[PDB]
Symmetry: D2
């Protein structure tokens, strides 16, 4: 087998029966124990035919954890039964970025026909999944799979975004988190674990602001036209050292530019087509850098797993069966999952 | 004493006779040996009455070198006759940024009424000038004052911009320099001295491309619509690790976005009101950060001076008298100074 | 004031009456609200006549907080009544290190005759004290002075030592803290606040191990011959990413070398004359760097103050009067102050 | 095939005929084009029987370049004929260090029985060699193999040592290089290429001081009792920002401690059993860190190759045949190779 696939442009994903794959040389077959739903899946399924490039059908799910079921020829660095998380943004493994584990920034992958699981290659929303190479597996030991699956993107992506500017986030700093969803609720917790920043969370929804306080935000601010003034009141007029925008709409990016401090940072993490920061003199403070980060690195995924194993990340989830996969995507689309949706096969 | 002042909104600067100042407690009086002209002075003098905030009259010149003439009460660490460069972007000296020498990013200066020489306080285009505090002087020893004056902004600003991302500029990297004027011709030389980056220079003017090659650029490319494709051809389709845009027009920022590499950097250094980078998904590569840097730090100015003393910077200048100051500004406006204009008071 | 001074080589410090100073141009007079005792004061007072270089008499105390009492001529940026901490390791203010606020690493100060309060210039163990320049004052707002005074060295020094290698201390890292005294008990708390490192504390004294657990250590291990094996058991045989040795005896440095990981770090912070790490092939792991850090930077002191104001540092103190100053030093010498001794004028 | 092997404890290496190997799955067979001699080979061959752990016989050579001769089953990313350099310090590929390319600091390799070529596995001093995995090959394009072979250790090791502290080596800094041999003569050139440090070279031999000046040292100091005072005279009494000791004898480490600046660095790179820095209060300046670095990282090797391709490294070599291999080791032992000895098979 059972899997959840995107099969027709503009249609909802469907539950299918397809062959259980067998690993070729160097590949590993996992029995999937948990598969996370990411809002990027919604954006992908909303692409018109002219833009959509991942092929049909596509087994969804780029947040995957499992146990090693079968080793392909020549694979010996894992044993059958090992609990592993899948490193998602597969790169070529050979370029200068990849040599540093920064496969998220590989520029050679596309030309070599290397695509990530759930985003061009078959994903984790299935009873079993293939992983191309052992370097794309990270051990998780006895971590609960349901809470582990989101670490692979909801954890990894905020972790990487924060890591890019961690030296800015010393005692006395303030970090703003915009969007307390799958990514944002983990982002707050990463900030608390790896920095002494004061954390201000921003969301449209009072229940998400409650979630933010539950996971350790120091303050919670309603998003929209009043947010910039409210944040500036909290920061004593100086603004926020860093803003991590997990929404990335034009309104939230505007809020971010209106509150960022001199020599601070805006990380535009959320993906809303057309929205952008306007980085120019008189439009942003001196020295305030802006970036659109993507995914994270191999060693960053290991660090996220280490945070989880140390008890520093309380991942808020709701569990679904494979048969409930399409229903779960409807819930994600409408904004009614408090945290991360996770499919648990069987 | 003789000085060059901006005295009337919309009018050319004029040569004046005003009193030689006397240093109060903590201040230092310099006999000016060289005063650099910066294109920012043109932009300032082009501001309409409603925007112009630096007061009239204003003695111009924020690139200053001199010899210590008189010590104000309680000043130590300098003797009469010492050759010094003036650190330009005065801050409060007390905040967290200033404590690190990063007075360029002080947020307290404005509210305390602290303004820089030539940009709210009296500048260096005069026989003598006041410096507010000893911490705003850096010794230059026997460096030629004419070539030293530009170090204080034409050197400092590119040096800071490059320093923000120096770890990116390893062997195999490429740095693009857009605009081979006062700042840009120094920026090329800094890149060559402190990194192993391949340097590609870009300018509208073929004589400035020649200047770029003279000061060590590896390649020089005509600016305009064909520049992005030409740069991409030189970088093997991978793009440039970093782009230092010393023009900052919309067209040059667009060129920068079209050539920057994944996980690279654009530094928008030149100031053209309204121009901005558009930093959003699908509009810039993943991981490519963008910033508008401002001036530089105390320790950075010392490092620039150290480069000059080591013979690493060939500063291209043309010398003017104080009486020629207004004529020199006309030359700067029309683009006919090959490098930096420098006034030498007699 | 009344002051406590070291007055005679080899003798205990004494309570004295000396003139209240007046600030000259650029100086600030503080009314002292709290003055910390540091174990370095013991080491200084144990120096023989041939080594001791700070002059007699010396008003002790290089951990100082106060309120601005008088401004010297030309001083700006502070008002009378402002609560401030004194930045201790005064530098020249002009060199490349000082320009970055790294006055702790100034090499010009000695030749210019610049000495720190309590260590060549008059210290904070007195009703009033002089500060040379406004850049050596950091505002503390409404922070309790008793808990604030130790921030200026018990806080600053561990903070700097940790900061030198903070990028190593990611999730999955382990930091060992040897010596849970004035410095060490703050070091544990800094590690918890600014990193995700697992913290293993080491001390001779079971009550100090309890203190370590109270302030957030993940494990606390008895020092001595068994400590290295115990630490290696806790780290799965891989050793510790960083070791912060706040004792710095040969035995503790040896423990540090026996537990540090490949590509890790040993910070020798505690001062024991003659003791040293042996950094050579076959004697330490590949890539494991070793340093003796000193004090900290201007911006680091500001950051320490920010941690305290945010409630991230529970500074364990015992309070003494000026008259009790000599008794407090005897207590420090014998090891009976649980945390930091602080004199309140 | 012909090879040079260490075959008997305490005896000179010998030229042998042994079978040409065949690559198994994931392995690559190279036709060797150049094999560097490293002084570590001398130290290894001087180990008594009780210490020597690399097995007999051992094909020597841990500096290897070649062309791809045969691909083992499942190998991708290289074609037959590709010119490649061998990354020497093989790690497990999977741990946190290896995920960052830092296989030089892998702690899992020993327990997994992973040993480097020339140092437990068969080396490059042979007509052909096996490489275990594609990730241990770096393309060199048309670089001359003779000058390329030393990049793999004589280049890599100094490059890594310098890289650990590159942010210290700003304009105005001084770097001391002790020992102008295989590693040291490359170290000087790396410092000149990637920093603005003033470079002071130190050697016992006047001809090696001449070599140092030939490759870009600013100053040259005779090693021994007068070296520390001479270096301090050159640095104005302040001492050297960093000392890279490629000898690592007690006398050179003592020199390094006597000249290092406050908040500087000593890198003990050369290996002399028993010698060590004494890092304690009153024995070294405040803030001066000391480390024994080992080899370098995957991305560092790529950077070294990039320096060579850009013309930044003039590698001084002497060429030997395989039959001359033992004679070349005698020359290395006696100190008569001016730079790096390189064996060029058939
Ligand atoms: N850059 C990357 O590599 C990367 C990786 C993964 C996901 N993403 C993107 O991150 C974004 C978030 O993904 P998710 O799975 O956490 O989404 P989610 O649907 O789980 O959460 C969205 C959250 O944002 C809040 N929100 C929406 N509009 C808002 C506004 N105007 N102001 C404040 N809050 C607002 C919602 O109320 C909700 O709490 C998506 O755009 C996704 O595509 C990016
Ligand atoms: N960010 C800061 O802190 C800071 C500090 C100093 C100066 N500036 C700004 O930097 C800019 C440069 O100042 P300068 O004094 O070196 O100027 P300048 O007049 O000396 O040099 C301008 C150069 O840019 C070239 N140029 C102009 N338009 C171009 C285009 N479209 N493409 C390529 N080249 C082009 C010119 O031919 C000339 O060589 C100005 O905008 C100035 O205000 C900024
Ligand atoms: N590097 C610097 O700039 C700097 C600055 C300030 C203080 N110091 C030094 O730091 C050291 C500590 O100062 P303090 O004021 O915190 O001392 P303290 O007397 O308050 O505490 C000492 C602690 O170390 C423990 N201890 C002693 N020997 C031990 C051993 N062998 N193993 C484990 N634990 C042991 C004690 O039980 C006690 O808890 C002193 O040497 C002091 O001079 C250094
Ligand atoms: N740390 C590592 O990862 C690593 C890697 C490779 C090599 N090494 C070691 O680096 C060292 C250098 O190797 P190499 O192949 O360049 O050696 P080499 O024999 O080619 O060069 C030695 C050089 O050091 C000089 N020298 C010797 N004694 C000296 C002294 N007392 N003072 C000043 N100069 C002196 C010689 O005159 C010669 O120029 C060796 O100990 C080697 O084992 C270490
Ligand atoms: C479609 C989207 C996927 C991001 C993700 O991995 O969540 C992207 O490629 O930008
Ligand atoms: C007025 C202008 C001055 C920049 C400069 O210092 O050259 C600015 O601050 O934007
Ligand atoms: C013998 C030495 C080898 C270093 C090298 O690779 O040159 C070591 O591993 O200790
Ligand atoms: Zn996703
Ligand atoms: Zn790649
Ligand atoms: Zn300017
Ligand atoms: Zn300031
Ligand atoms: Zn102390
Ligand atoms: Zn100084
Ligand atoms: Zn070697
Ligand atoms: Zn490994």
């Amino acid at each position: 087998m059972k899997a959840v696939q995107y099969t027709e442009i503009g249609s909802e994903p469907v539950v299918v029966d397809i062959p259980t794959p067998t690993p070729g040389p160097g590949e590993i077959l996992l029995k999937v124990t948990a598969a996370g739903l990411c809002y990027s899946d919604i954006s992908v399924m909303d692409m018109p035919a002219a833009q959509y490039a991942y092929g049909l059908p596509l087994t969804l799910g780029h947040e995957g954890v499992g146990t090693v079921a079968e080793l392909g020829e020549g694979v010996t660095g894992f044993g059958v039964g090992d609990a592993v998380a899948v490193y998602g943004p597969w790169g070529c493994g050979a370029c200068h970025a990849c040599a540093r584990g920064r496969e998220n920034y590989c520029t050679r992958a596309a030309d070599l026909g290397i695509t990530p699981p759930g985003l061009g290659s078959p994903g984790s929303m299935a009873e079993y999944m293939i992983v191309d190479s052992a370097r794309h597996l990270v051990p998780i030991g006895d971590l609960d799979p349901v809470a582990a699956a989101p670490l692979t993107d909801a954890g990894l992506t905020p972790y990487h975004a924060i890591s890019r500017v961690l030296p800015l986030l010393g005692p006395g700093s303030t970090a703003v988190v915009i969007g307390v969803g799958g990514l944002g609720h983990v982002g707050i917790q990463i900030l608390r674990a790896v920095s002494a920043a004061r954390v201000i969370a921003v969301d449209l929804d009072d229940d998400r602001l409650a979630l933010a306080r539950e996971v350790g935000a120091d303050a919670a601010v309603k998003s929209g036209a009043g947010a910039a003034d409210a944040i500036r009141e909290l920061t004593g007029g100086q603004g926020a050292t860093a803003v991590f925008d997990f929404v990335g709409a034009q309104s939230t990016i505007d809020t971010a530019q209106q509150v960022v401090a001199v020599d601070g940072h805006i990380s535009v993490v959320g993906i809303h087509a057309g929205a952008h920061a306007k980085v120019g003199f008189f439009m942003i403070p001196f020295g305030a850098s802006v970036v659109t980060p993507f995914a994270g690195t191999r060693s960053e995924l290991m660090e996220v797993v280490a945070l989880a194993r140390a008890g520093r990340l309380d991942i808020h989830t709701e569990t679904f069966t494979l048969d409930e996969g399409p229903a779960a995507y409807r819930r994600l689309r409408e904004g009614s999952i408090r945290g991360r949706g996770v499919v648990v096969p069987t």
